[PDB]
Amino acid sequence: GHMADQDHAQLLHVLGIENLRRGADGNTDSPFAANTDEAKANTALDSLPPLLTSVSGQAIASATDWEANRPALLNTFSQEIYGYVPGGAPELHWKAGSTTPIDDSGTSAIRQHFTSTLVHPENAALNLSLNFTLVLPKSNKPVPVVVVMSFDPGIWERFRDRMPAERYAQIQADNARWREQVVNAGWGYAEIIPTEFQADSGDGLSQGIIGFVNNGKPRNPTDWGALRAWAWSASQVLTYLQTDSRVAADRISVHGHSRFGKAALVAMAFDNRFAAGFISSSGEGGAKLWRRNFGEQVGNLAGAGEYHWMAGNFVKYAGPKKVNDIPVDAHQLLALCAPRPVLVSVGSQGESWVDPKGMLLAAYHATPAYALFGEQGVTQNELPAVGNGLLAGKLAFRQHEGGHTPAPNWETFITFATRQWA
């Protein structure tokens, strides 16, 4: 849309940036196609920022030192990468309807819809109606709940009449399956559609929650973008869930896939109340190291089509700065989740855009922070055989046998979280 283009252009003007390097293309016949040749993907890894040097420039030698550095390290991710949550972000007050059984079987599993209304003090066109759906298995005790970020299912339906049908059937089956796997494990889930909180476009940056807080004005370059706002939305659901006696307050997980996998990891790192993370095929801007040249590139995320995911400040790393200059990398983002358990998940079929091994490497290079806490992580720097999970530490990696989908790793994640919480 033209508004994304206009805001992007004004952002470059505000940072004093003439040109950005192009992003990569995904089709291999293009001159700009992404590198997928492992031999050409590691030039920048020598500038990898030292995980265990604090922002003050001291050596980090203990769990205590890592926690003392955490706010400063988060602050760098806020100003330069994902943006600050403004203090003006409001409290969400939720109203719930009645519970209804999830199916007519006589299960005691229930569904309940929650709504929060925000009236803007100045401009009613910024008003918001925000939602999540809670699903709980029946239990005599508080149950774990995974906060789930989903793609708007109105999208599968808009295109039901135009899809191969084998594939529509398979998406619908996967969508039903994880819901059943969660409940059968004695977990509930709390589902949000993130794009109802903040649109997935620069067009919407003056709308949604970012626009509400900004009174419909353009972002300053240190303000949150969409990933951080989606993570904030998940965090507000966790805040509700910790007031609900049906929920185990120390076993609220977060999950998202693809662009929501990026957001879920941002949530995991920034909100240490989340008890476990299922981070699926997140890629560039998520668990993939920026300094890998493999699949999606910084120029993709600094460009008009995806910059809205990021702080405005981030686009400088595609222009007057290079990937080598990013003050942090994805191993520090995973490290920020320590000591809490995180599964980095990716498929094996058609996943080059997210760089399976660059995510592995992020976990590998994050692990010395988990080690400070007496915990284990990822200890090899090459991909295991597909399907062989590195599942023993609090920081874990499993590449499954499928494509760009989380469905083959829900079983692994639920089992993993249960074992790591014991």
Numbering used by the authors: -2 to 0, 27 to 445
Q: What's the paper's own text on this?
A:
The aim of the present study was to investigate structure-function relationships of TtCE15A, a novel CE15 enzyme from the Gram-negative bacterium Teredinibacter turnerae. T. turnerae has been isolated from the gills of a wood-boring shipworm, a mollusk that digests lignocellulose in marine environments.
Three TtCE15A molecules were found in the asymmetric unit, with a Cα root mean square deviation below 0.2 Å (all atoms <1 Å), indicating a high degree of similarity between the protein chains. Like the previously determined bacterial structures, TtCE15A has three inserted regions relative to the fungal CE15 structures (Reg1, residues 122–134; Reg2, 175–200; Reg3, 399–415). Although being shorter in sequence (26 versus 40–45 residues), Reg2 of TtCE15A forms a much longer helix compared with the Regs2 of OtCE15A, SuCE15C, and MZ0003. The longer Reg2 helix present in TtCE15A builds up a larger ridge around the previously proposed lignin-binding region and thus presents a deeper substrate-binding groove compared with previously solved structures. On the ridge built up by Reg2, multiple hydrophobic residues are found on the side facing the active site (Phe-174, Ile-178, Trp-179, Phe-182, Met-186, and Ile-194), whereas the opposite face is more hydrophilic. The serine and histidine residues of the catalytic triad found in all previously solved structures (fungal and bacterial) are conserved in TtCE15A (Ser-281 and His-427). However, the proposed canonical glutamate of the catalytic triad is absent (similar to MZ0003), and this position is occupied by a serine residue (Ser-304). In TtCE15A, a glutamate, Glu-374, is found in an equivalent position, which would likely fulfill the same role.
